[PDB]
Design a protein around this ligand. Structure first.
Ligand SMILES: C[C@@H]1O[C@H](OP(=O)(O)OP(=O)(O)OC[C@H]2O[C@@H](n3cnc4c(=O)[nH]c(N)nc43)[C@H](O)[C@@H]2O)[C@@H](O)[C@H](O)[C@@H]1O
Ligand SMILES: C[C@@H]1O[C@H](OP(=O)(O)OP(=O)(O)OC[C@H]2O[C@@H](n3cnc4c(=O)[nH]c(N)nc43)[C@H](O)[C@@H]2O)[C@@H](O)[C@H](O)[C@@H]1O
Lengths: 350, 350
């Protein structure tokens, strides 16, 4: 059959993988609160000549996420549910308020908005708005699940379709534990285990080095006097930065600081190898020189596969991440929540 | 001196004049609720080779709006307040949440967003978000004025700058009475009085005929089974359309229906002339033929000045508007609220 309560489908249409997963956590909680089945999103990759949509199940296990709330794959939704439950004629786009491009949602305007819905051959014929609902999409505390059910009954609205993820960004502390239900696919887990077995004598420290030019730019624009959250910064500084001040040294550690701190961590755990995940400079030669007194080496994947890297860092004896990066935030959350007890993590500059 | 509580400045960056005034009502109430002075917006005109910014005071009286809440002109703000209170270095843009274009507000992206802020020589250097405040910008019922003051103290944030008006669209019934405080400038009022004296024997019926091609398109896309608000439709059908169903005949009356209803209204009040305001077809010859049994004529401005037209319709013995048009909504509100008692109005198809 199909879910009489209906469905939610959305585009993780903001940012790269870290941003997508960060919003996806909130969407999961949203769908559960509305008691509608979530269509699992295609994730989006930008480092190709065109945008690339990746099936949820290529990366994560459907069985594990199902344990949190009802889900269906994108394949099952588009091939089996959509044609009868949600024909082209009632494909309404949902958004907060009508917007300047006729004022509406404009769901397929720009990238990745267009290519995402085009990939599943979906166009919208009308708009629905939810900005007038008391509490927005924040359904637990400021709880308005009754108001959503009342405004969008399942019979008239079997599918709620959002071109922006109906979840805060950055994520709220309350949804971080949902990372427990995102388990890497068998394929990725096995690649992680093989790389570790072949290359990383235990215990190993894994580090995330986020250092490409766009990043240095983002860090150097930190306004230390307003001290607002920046991407995942609350993962190390607490909600609203109650623990301290985000600095440039935390956001973008110098090469010398990275080395000092790696060597320090290797010493604290008696590490027998280091794993490096980087968006650009893995600093393998520099780290190896710094590691010579310990007669151990740093290792990376060539090429660096971002998903296997995340998985390897989740398995590390110690993880040292970048506090600002939502990419590091994935690891921090998995390390915190995948098991019954937290595996330890640290952050550069902290 | 200057307001120690600080300022709000915003772009009425959605839609044409009717949409701008409709949001501007909500902004006025918002500013009053936060007890900050509102910088009066430049209104925006699109029917030129480029976008044109119009000073508030060219159209409306500053003295009258001041009676509702503290305001300052755009000229006074940019020439006298801005340089010391809000230098280039602390010009932060405010928005609901970071968005896909680095994720931020992107306040000057597109039109009229760019040209509006460029007109007052303003660029933004950082972003602030308010989506995390319980209740959004809806400060009376769901009241979060304390939360705004706490998050944005006046000393660190002397100017709250919004590239989208911090007000619902379409407007909520609760702000419609604020139309009382928008009185046409002396210049427009006098033009209205002269046109009436010279051309419109009293009592006169004024009609708004909204009939250009973009409009017929918007009307023909009405989904009668979801029966959601469309622009100003709640002005005749009540909040959430509790009074009835929006139809195409209401949104886009036929020529025959327009004539029938004009003739009917002329008969009910013993009218001695008709005034027509139109975005395209004033139907002067057709209305005159239909009016021959009454030996009266229909009259229009050549060219049709939209502000003087609004003002003339506000002064009419009877107004017959278009329920869907926010342009008609201005007149309906002024007729309802400018005086101590409502002047009568009606709507085609109602
Ligand atoms: C500047 C801002 O940075 C934010 O990134 P941040 O939170 O680190 O995290 P993400 O949203 O994942 O964006 C960073 C992307 O860069 C690549 N990347 C980062 N670290 C690694 C790595 O260790 N290995 C590999 N192979 N790739 C990496 C990868 O595609 C990743 O999704 C953005 O999402 C914002 O939208 C904005 O662009
Ligand atoms: C299709 C939708 O229609 C909405 O318009 P709607 O609510 O009627 O009201 P407005 O937001 O004013 O947009 C209609 C504009 O068209 C012109 N116009 C309409 N009626 C008259 C008139 O009687 N005389 C003159 N001179 N000009 C008129 C004028 O520029 C007016 O601001 C838009 O604001 C939405 O953004 C969207 O475009």
């Amino acid at each position: 059959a199909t879910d009489p309560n209906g469905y939610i489908v959305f585009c993780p249409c903001m940012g790269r993988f870290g941003n997508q997963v960060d919003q996806f956590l909130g969407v999961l909680a949203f769908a559960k609160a509305l008691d509608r089945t979530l269509v699992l999103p295609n994730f989006i990759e930008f480092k190709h000549p065109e945008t690339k949509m990746i099936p949820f199940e290529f990366l994560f296990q459907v069985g594990t996420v199902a344990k949190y709330t009802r889900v269906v794959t994108m394949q099952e939704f588009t091939k089996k549910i959509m044609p009868t439950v949600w024909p082209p004629e009632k494909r309404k786009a949902f958004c907060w308020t009508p917007r300047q491009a006729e004022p509406g949602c404009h769901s397929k305007e720009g990238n990745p908005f267009g290519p995402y819905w085009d990939q599943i051959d979906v166009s919208f014929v009308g708009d629905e708005y939810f900005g007038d609902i008391p509490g927005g999409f924040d359904l637990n505390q400021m709880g308005s699940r009754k108001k959503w059910l009342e405004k969008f009954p399942s019979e008239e609205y079997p599918v709620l379709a959002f071109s922006s993820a109906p979840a805060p960004f950055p994520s709220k502390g309350k949804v971080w534990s949902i990372q427990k239900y995102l388990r890497w696919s068998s394929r990725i887990t096995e690649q992680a285990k093989k790389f570790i077995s072949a290359n990383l004598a235990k215990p190993f420290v894994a580090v995330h080095l986020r250092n490409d030019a766009d990043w240095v730019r983002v860090c150097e624009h930190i306004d230390t006097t307003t001290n607002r959250p920046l991407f995942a910064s609350e993962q190390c500084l607490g909600e609203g930065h109650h623990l301290g001040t985000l600095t440039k040294e935390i956001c973008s550690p110098s090469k010398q600081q990275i080395l000092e701190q790696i060597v320090e961590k290797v010493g604290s755990i008696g590490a027998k190898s280091v794993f490096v995940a980087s968006d650009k400079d893995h600093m393998i030669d520099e780290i190896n020189e710094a590691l010579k007194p310990y007669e151990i080496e740093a290792h990376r994947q060539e090429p660096d596969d971002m998903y296997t890297s995340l998985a390897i860092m989740g398995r590390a004896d110690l993880f040292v991440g970048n506090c600002v990066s939502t990419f590091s935030h994935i690891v921090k959350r998995e390390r915190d929540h995948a098991g019954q007890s937290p595996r330890p993590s640290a952050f550069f500059g902290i």
